[PDB]
């Protein structure tokens, strides 16, 4: 058969997702790229980013536990 029939359930929602259901991450290791600041400044990139608003942006990875804050660093 090339025709397929479907069953729809539509009485009540089974679950409710967050408006931010589809979210993204940045690997924590990108913080070790020298040009981190430059990269995130990209207009091309920010336009894409707004395209998926609203969403969470998680900054983490294996490197999450191998990063340290330096108040002295410029």
């Amino acid at each position: 058969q090339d025709v397929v029939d479907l069953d729809f359930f539509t009485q009540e929602p089974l679950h409710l997702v967050s408006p931010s259901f589809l979210s993204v991450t940045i690997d924590a290791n990108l913080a070790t790229d020298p040009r981190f600041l430059i990269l995130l400044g990209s207009p091309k990139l920010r336009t894409l980013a707004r395209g998926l608003s609203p969403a969470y942006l998680r900054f983490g990875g294996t490197k999450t536990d191998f990063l340290i804050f330096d108040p002295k660093k410029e």
Partner: protein, 385 residues
């Protein structure tokens, strides 16, 4: 293989601005490996970060640790779930004393659950489950080095996810029932993704399937590795150009609403034909409460046609059919929406996504190894209002 690195106030600023200006809510993974003599988390580095963030007016959610089940293998240190929970409690206290005392806290970003990952999660939830706003765990299908193109198309593979989701819920429900569960990090393959696969049209089957099942099974938020970066699984390449999975992701956003319905095929066999159903996204001006969005994945080697339950069988439907731009077929990095190729207009300007309006009653064509969304207009489903 891995040693410590630093970051600056400047880095934090960059990261925050990226989020705020792009309409995103930042979640920040703190370092959990800073430890005392007696191996409690030393929270003093985090204190500096929090204070700096406060002083700048930054609204931020926090995590602590990443894949703590692997700490022993990654850094020769074992932290038990009970202790990690205590550490999350310490973090809770600090967040409460800060200028944004309603900051969110999520954890523990464990890996997918084999026997002891599950046991660690359990003891974590026992000890510290009361202070976390969602339970985060991570999942990948394959090893990026052993994945073949055939694996990215195999339904049996996609269904190994099903067992993983359930195993996690089993643990949560036995300890903190009714708590939200999030996919905290997830994609196609580990080790940076599989080269010339995780970045192609072929990756969309796993990505769309994963959203479909996640929604159905009770996952409230899905975090894709990565928006962009070194890995093959990026949504945006090194040139800052969008890939197939980006356009898929954008399209999903415009069309799929929050309420989760369901669909299945009548005949037993639908392993190769996967279907999913939600209310349509209300915010789209083209659509209205009651409208339904069905999305569908065809892993058969020939075209399938879908026939809708009446009353919907006589409704006006918009097609959004996604086809690789040739001539590299499924491993193409370009994609077409209803026969127009998807491209940015320029670097500040996304294209509109043009539907294919269907004459009411028209059967639903789904070519081999493709996926599509269908919005059923004037469906007026009570549940969706």
């Amino acid at each position: 293989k891995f040693k410590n690195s630093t970051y600056s106030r400047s880095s934090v600023d960059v990261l925050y601005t990226f989020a705020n200006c792009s309409g995103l809510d930042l979640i920040f993974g703190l370092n959990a490996l800073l430890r005392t003599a007696d191996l409690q988390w030393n929270s003093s580095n985090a204190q500096l970060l929090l204070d700096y963030c406060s002083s700048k007016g930054y609204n931020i959610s926090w995590e602590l640790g990443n894949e703590p089940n692997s700490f022993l293998k990654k850094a020769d240190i074992f932290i038990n779930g009970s202790q990690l929970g205590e550490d999350f409690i310490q973090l809770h206290k600090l967040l409460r004393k800060s200028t944004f005392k309603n900051a969110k806290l999520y954890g523990p970003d464990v890996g997918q659950p084999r026997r002891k990952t599950a046991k660690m999660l359990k003891s974590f939830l026992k000890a510290g489950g009361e202070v976390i706003d969602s339970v985060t765990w991570h999942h990948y299908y394959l090893n990026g080095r052993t994945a073949t193109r055939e694996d990215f198309l195999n339904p049996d593979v996609l269904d190994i996810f099903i067992s993983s989701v359930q195993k996690v819920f089993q643990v949560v429900e036995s300890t903190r029932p009714g708590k939200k569960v999030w996919l905290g990090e997830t994609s196609s393959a580990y080790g940076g993704g599989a080269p010339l696969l995780s970045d192609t049209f072929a990756a969309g089957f796993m990505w769309l399937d994963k959203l479909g099942l996640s929604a159905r099974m009770g996952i409230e938020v899905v975090m894709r590795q990565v928006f962009f970066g070194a890995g093959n699984y990026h949504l945006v390449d090194e040139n800052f150009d969008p890939l197939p999975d980006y356009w898929l992701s954008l399209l999903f956003k415009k069309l799929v609403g929050t309420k989760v319905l369901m669909a299945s095929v009548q005949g037993s066999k639908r392993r190769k034909l996967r279907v999913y159903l939600h209310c349509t996204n209300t915010d789209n001006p083209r659509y209205k409460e009651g409208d339904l969005t069905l999305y569908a994945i065809n892993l058969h080697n020939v075209t399938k046609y879908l026939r809708l339950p009446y009353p919907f069988s006589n409704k006006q439907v918009d097609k959004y059919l996604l086809r690789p731009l040739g001539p590299h077929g499924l491993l193409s990095k370009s994609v077409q929406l209803n026969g127009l190729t998807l491209k940015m207009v320029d670097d500040q300007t996304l294209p509109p996504l043009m539907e294919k309006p269907l004459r009411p009653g028209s059967s639903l064509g789904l070519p081999a190894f493709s996926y599509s969304f269908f919005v059923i207009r004037n469906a007026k489903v009570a549940a969706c209002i």
